Design a protein around this nucleic acid. Structure first.
Ligand SMILES: [Mg+2]
Ligand SMILES: [Mg+2]
Ligand SMILES: [Mg+2]
Ligand SMILES: [Mg+2]
Ligand SMILES: [Mg+2]
Ligand SMILES: [Mg+2]
Ligand SMILES: [Mg+2]
Ligand SMILES: [Mg+2]
Ligand SMILES: [Mg+2]
Ligand SMILES: [Mg+2]
Ligand SMILES: [Mg+2]
Ligand SMILES: [Mg+2]
Ligand SMILES: [Mg+2]
Ligand SMILES: [Mg+2]
Ligand SMILES: [Mg+2]
Ligand SMILES: [Mg+2]
Ligand SMILES: [Mg+2]
Ligand SMILES: [Mg+2]
Ligand SMILES: [Mg+2]
Ligand SMILES: [Mg+2]
Ligand SMILES: [Mg+2]
Ligand SMILES: [Mg+2]
Ligand SMILES: [Mg+2]
Lengths: 123, 129, 205, 47, 82, 157, 80
RNA sequence: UAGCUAGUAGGUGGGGUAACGGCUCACCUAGGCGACGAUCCCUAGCUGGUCUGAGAGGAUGACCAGCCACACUGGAACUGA
RNA sequence: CCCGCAGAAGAAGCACCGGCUAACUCCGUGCCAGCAGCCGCGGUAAUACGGAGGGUGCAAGCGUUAAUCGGAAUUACUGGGCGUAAAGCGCACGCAGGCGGUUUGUUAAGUCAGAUGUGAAAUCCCCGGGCUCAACCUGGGAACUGCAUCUGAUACUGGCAA
């Protein structure tokens, strides 16, 4: 705090960690998506979260979250991973872009359809 | 031992008024008189005395316009651990002009307003406010 | 772009006449314009501190028919244009040609003036223009193309301007249907109620 | 679709083994009044 | 070889040339010794469309500069006072 | 004529034998638009009954603090117990841009200006008492002329 | 008048050379303090007269060696 | 990452480059850098500027422009101002 | 760029509505399906889920991730703390380093002022113009917080001397 102490050891600006290790921190990534399973949340919540373990193109095997209502994913069929941890799941720090590669949009969805990638009811 | 006796002068001025005293006495030197002469002109104080042959004791008489002291805050600026030397274009305007900022210019120890009239720059001693 | 929906609904949220359908009627006198903002019309809102600061800025845009993207650039321009920013923001919105044609009286509404200016009918300094956002410089003239003279709308809108405040920062002749912008409007020269300091503080954060 | 439970191998019983999984944990409902029914703001805090 | 040529600023189809003292190796808009004046071809009745320090150009042509053809013909248009 | 403004209203409890009793606390400020500001805290057991107990404590304890033309005089540091409040003159900067609870105590004072940043812990009861301390610690050009220098023409120019 | 610098000799024996070090006062650009700072040079001198720990005068010359371009002008004192 | 360096620090004479110089040799003297951080490891083109910020700073340097570096990888020389 | 058409004719969507943060209620599902940025909502009267009515925020663009800065005075030089919240080394001696009472003389490195050279142009900023005007283009200045040299001031700081 003394000025003579700051010319010696400068005011060391700490650095924060990146919330998502998406490697070079690029908007989305593409992974093959092995092991599509379900999980139960933390203590206050109680549900059956649709979770997938994505083998990213970098080489990582981070897990992701299929946010939506209906999913038709398999042990393959590449998907597009988007940042954002949920809250109540351990280790889940990514989302799935519904409406991309082989991840179809949510059937029966007409209120936030750009989220979840539903086209439009034509008129 | 004391490092900057000039910062001791302001400490006598601050604590003297805080204790509600009529006058204070401190060991004298050239600069303590020179800043007192600035404070005497500016009205922040009543007359001083440097009476004493071998041990000059500087004796400032404090000033109270009302029940509250006149010298509200008197902050040392160019302390020895961090000496500041501002130029003509960046002399501070303490309390937007409602307080002085005593500078030591090459032409002498002056207030900031008179040194700005003089067009000089120097060591920023204190912020008498 | 431009808001193209129901016009009184904008004036219904502000609880005041935004002159969007300003003509030979009072309000409409029959559709509840005092207090029935939407469906929940009896629901009297409290309007927290942000909701007041938003609503004042929303009032001005609905008056002058501008959009947020172009409005923020007026704020940036007003903030560098010396002096009181809030008056300068009012100096710019009054400087729009789209407002000038309205104040001259050729517009029944600014929406009529927006169509009239855009459909190649108005000439500033003998130069035809189409931009609604033309900043009318001081000591200039505004006029109409003669093929746009006698359109039976520039007549009808001009009569209603007699029932207006007759602004003094600009004068108008009605012979050859042209007017002259004279000086910048002062803050006290108009509007008397449209707050400006709430707009500055909104963008101040 | 397939529930991932927290036990690697399963021997001698499926339904009974899932009974000691956190899927079938006890769910205690936080009561609205009485013991353990205090809330800071609740669901809509307008005063 | 030092020469006095033109740059090409401005937008597409609306150019603003700049009479510039540059070595004749660098590109159209590259490094230059000293920008001396300008030019505006699509200028009609405004300010000048062409203003350039003829006292400076004589200082360069004496040292060994080369006046480019479009430059010399524009100097010819603004000879000394005509 | 006064322009009272409610700032914050919360709910404190006591915890007696069979439960806790939610007494409500209010925090209002009456003003003048001229320089007289006073905050009345108050608290009761009902919400509209607590502001009335806050309206009275405000009016009886208003402090008359002078000011130039709708703005503060010099920069001032209103520190009080949780907040290191700073207010800056902001000459004709046409905005009462300030934090929560600092906007209310200034726009009833008749300030159509001053920039203000609330350092330290933001706390409504304290940040109101911070600026009230901050305005009282501000001196008039005539007031500083009275105690030193002795000419408002001299000290200012 | 030609450019020249003072400085005190730190290292002595170099076989027809010497090493000086100039104390210079730099205001730290962030914190602000007139910090004493030292730059070492390699100073040539014919007649190796000046020893160690003495204030000399150097001027910048044509480079006489690998990172050695300074030379001696005068000497204010040799030793007390 | 705490000791690092032996053509390395410097001198005398020869040679060499457009040009000074360990740039390169012979001999001689043992020094040189080092907590104001040497060597080593990792990462990275630099600057005008750019994006933010009240300011101070922080982060980053695509386009436009100056400089440097590279031209399948490693190395060398010729021609030529 | 200017003129003509029995022609409004070819051109409006996108998130959000518990609070933070503008914006309200009903049906269907009942801690199941799902929402999320944070606090946290859903357990058969949900304005927080899904779908409709309206409402708001923006608009040929919105919304979500991603990166930096701001908010963050949560790296504090401007501008923070250390009895108990994280923090005074167990204590002391002590080199380098940092700072240092008072008087006078001197020098003028630090400091301050003025001039010169340079600080490329462009960009940013301020007055002026030009494409129907704005983005953009652009003339003239300011600025480029700097560095160096020279000439002075020389109180304060430093060196030297008594
Ligand atoms: Mg647009
Ligand atoms: Mg009571
Ligand atoms: Mg060399
Ligand atoms: Mg040799
Ligand atoms: Mg590229
Ligand atoms: Mg380039
Ligand atoms: Mg080159
Ligand atoms: Mg090769
Ligand atoms: Mg029709
Ligand atoms: Mg939602
Ligand atoms: Mg709903
Ligand atoms: Mg952050
Ligand atoms: Mg702290
Ligand atoms: Mg403890
Ligand atoms: Mg202890
Ligand atoms: Mg010592
Ligand atoms: Mg100078
Ligand atoms: Mg100069
Ligand atoms: Mg123009
Ligand atoms: Mg220009
Ligand atoms: Mg300057
Ligand atoms: Mg003297
Ligand atoms: Mg010192």
């Amino acid at each position: 705090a003394t000025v003579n102490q700051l010319v010696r050891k400068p005011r060391a600006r700490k650095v924060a960690k990146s919330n998502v290790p998406a490697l070079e921190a690029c908007p989305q990534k593409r992974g093959v998506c092995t092991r599509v399973y379900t999980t139960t949340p933390k203590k206050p919540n109680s549900a059956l979260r649709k979770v997938c373990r994505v083998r990213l193109t970098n080489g990582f095997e981070v897990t992701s979250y299929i946010g939506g209502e209906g999913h038709n994913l398999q042990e393959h069929s590449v998907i597009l991973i988007r940042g954002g941890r949920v809250k109540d799941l351990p280790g889940v720090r990514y989302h799935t872009v519904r409406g991309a590669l082989d991840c179809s949009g949510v059937k029966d969805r007409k209120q936030a359809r750009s989220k979840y990638g539903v086209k439009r009811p034509k008129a | 031992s004391m490092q900057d006796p000039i910062a001791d002068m302001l400490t006598r001025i601050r604590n003297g008024q805080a204790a509600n005293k009529a006058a204070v006495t401190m060991p004298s030197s050239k600069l303590k008189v020179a800043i007192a002469n600035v404070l005497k002109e500016e009205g922040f104080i009543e007359d001083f005395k440097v009476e004493g042959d071998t041990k000059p004791e500087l004796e400032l008489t404090l000033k109270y316009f009302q029940g509250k002291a006149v010298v509200e805050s008197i902050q040392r600026v160019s302390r020895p651990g961090l000496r500041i030397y501002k130029r003509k274009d960046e002399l501070p305007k303490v309390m937007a002009g409602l307080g002085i900022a005593v500078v030591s210019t090459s032409k002498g120890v002056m207030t900031d307003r008179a040194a700005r009239q003089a067009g000089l720059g120097g060591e920023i001693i204190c912020y008498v406010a | 772009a431009r808001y193209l929906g129901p016009k009184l609904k904008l004036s219904r949220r502000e609880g005041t006449d935004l002159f969007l359908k300003s003509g030979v009627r009072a309000i409409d006198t029959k559709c509840k314009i005092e207090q029935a903002p939407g469906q929940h019309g009896a629901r009297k809102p409290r309007l927290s501190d942000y909701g007041v600061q938003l609503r004042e800025k929303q009032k001005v845009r609905r008056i002058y028919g501008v959009l947020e993207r172009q409005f923020r650039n007026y704020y940036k321009e007003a903030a560098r244009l010396k002096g009181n920013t809030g008056e300068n923001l009012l100096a710019l919105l009054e400087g729009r040609l789209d407002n000038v044609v309205y104040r001259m009286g050729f517009g029944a509404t600014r929406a009529e003036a927006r169509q009239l200016v855009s459909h190649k009918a108005i000439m500033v300094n003998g130069r035809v223009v189409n931009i609604a956002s033309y900043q009318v410089s001081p000591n200039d003239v505004v006029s109409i193309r003669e093929k746009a003279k006698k359109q039976s709308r520039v007549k009808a809108a001009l009569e209603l301007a007699e029932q207006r405040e007759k602004p003094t920062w600009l004068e108008v002749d009605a012979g050859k249907m042209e007017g002259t912008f004279k000086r910048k409007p002062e803050r006290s020269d108009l509007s008397a109620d449209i707050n400006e300091h709430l707009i500055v503080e909104l963008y101040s954060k | 679709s397939r529930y991932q439970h927290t036990k690697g191998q399963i021997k001698d019983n499926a339904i009974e083994a899932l009974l000691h999984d956190p899927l079938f944990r006890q769910r205690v409902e936080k009561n609205k009044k009485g013991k353990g029914s205090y809330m800071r703001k609740g669901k809509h805090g307008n005063r | 070889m030092v020469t006095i040529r033109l740059a090409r600023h401005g937008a597409k189809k609306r150019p603003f040339y700049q009479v510039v003292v540059a070595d004749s190796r660098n590109a159209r808009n590259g490094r230059f010794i000293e920008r001396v004046g300008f030019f505006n071809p699509i200028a009609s009745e405004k300010e000048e469309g062409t203003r350039l320090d003829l006292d400076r150009i004589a200082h360069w042509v004496g040292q060994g500069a080369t006046i480019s053809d479009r430059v010399a013909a524009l100097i010819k248009e603004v000879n000394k006072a005509a | 004529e006064l322009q009272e403004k409610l700032i914050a209203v919360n709910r404190v409890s006591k915890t007696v034998k069979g439960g806790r009793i939610f007494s409500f606390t209010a925090l209002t400020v009456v003003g003048d638009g001229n320089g007289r500001v006073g905050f009345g805290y108050g608290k009761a057991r009902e919400v509209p009954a607590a502001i009335q107990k806050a309206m009275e404590k405000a009016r009886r304890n208003m402090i008359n603090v002078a000011l130039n033309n709708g703005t503060l005089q010099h920069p001032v540091k209103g520190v009080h117990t949780g907040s290191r409040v700073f207010m800056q003159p902001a000459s004709e900067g046409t905005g009462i841009i300030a934090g929560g609870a600092m906007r209310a105590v200034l726009e009833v004072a008749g300030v159509h200006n001053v920039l203000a940043k609330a350092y330290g812990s933001t706390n409504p009861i304290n940040v109101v008492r911070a600026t009230i301390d901050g305005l009282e610690n501000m001196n008039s050009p005539e007031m500083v002329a009275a105690k030193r220098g002795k000419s408002v023409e001299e000290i200012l120019g | 008048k030609i450019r020249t610098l003072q400085g005190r000799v730190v290292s002595d024996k170099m076989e027809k050379s010497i090493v000086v070090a100039i104390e210079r006062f730099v205001k730290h650009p962030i914190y602000g303090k007139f910090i004493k700072r030292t730059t070492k040079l390699h100073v040539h001198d014919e007649n190796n007269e000046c020893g160690i720990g003495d204030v000399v005068e150097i001027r910048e010359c044509r480079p006489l060696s690998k990172t050695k371009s300074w030379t001696l002008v005068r000497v204010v004192e040799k030793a007390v």
